[PDB]
Amino acid sequence: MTEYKLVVVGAGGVGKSALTIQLIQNHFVDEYDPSIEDSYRKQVVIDGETCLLDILDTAGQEEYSAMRDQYMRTGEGFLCVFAINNTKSFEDIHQYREQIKRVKDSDDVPMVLVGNKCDLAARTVESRQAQDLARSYGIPYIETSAKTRQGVEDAFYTLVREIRQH
Structure with missing residues (x-):
């Protein structure tokens, strides 16, 4: 019963949902998930140990969302993603x-x-x-x-491994 709860944050509008989708589907899409059934769980092997990876997507409002508000309050971990071609995404x-x-x-x-x-x-x-x-x-x-370079998946694994160390 090992579960790791990581919250997704980053540039607003690029595709935080799509990056979550490609984790569970192993494929990059343009379609984004609605607030309903936004967050997903995926069984993965991290640090050589089989565990459950919970990826939290935000829903509804920015300031009013249990997926961010509850989980971020715990502080177990969160990933910051941005677009390399978008200048504003850094902000x-x-x-x-x-x-x-x-x-x-x-x-x-x-x-x-x-x-x-x-x-x-x-x-x-x-x-x-x-x-x-x-x-x-x-x-x-x-x-x-999205093309070849693997980052997001490894980054989530890194967050989990950091949890395993801390």
Whole structure:
């Protein structure tokens, strides 16, 4: 009965739902899930140990959602995802991290910064800046892509492994 509850956050509008879908389906889609039946659970092997990975998608309002409000309050873990071709996508996570940081001034919660389309030449300033941005916020940076580059899945595993260590 081992379950890991990780909350999905990141740029608003890119495709947080799609990244959740491709985890459970093993395929990248454009269709997004409705607030109803948004969050999913998936049986996975992490750290060599078989466990249940619970991916929490937000529902309804930004400020009023049990999927964020309840689970984030626990602080078990959450993933920050953004679009590498979207300049503004950085800002959304910057708000999330700095705001959560104030809440987590006394708490132990794993964080990972993930940028997509790392196989796509058409993107913002080199991801090296995203690493520097991640470093300024004291968090690791993972590269992912819908194309080939695996990041999101490994990043969620990293969050779980960080839970296993802490």
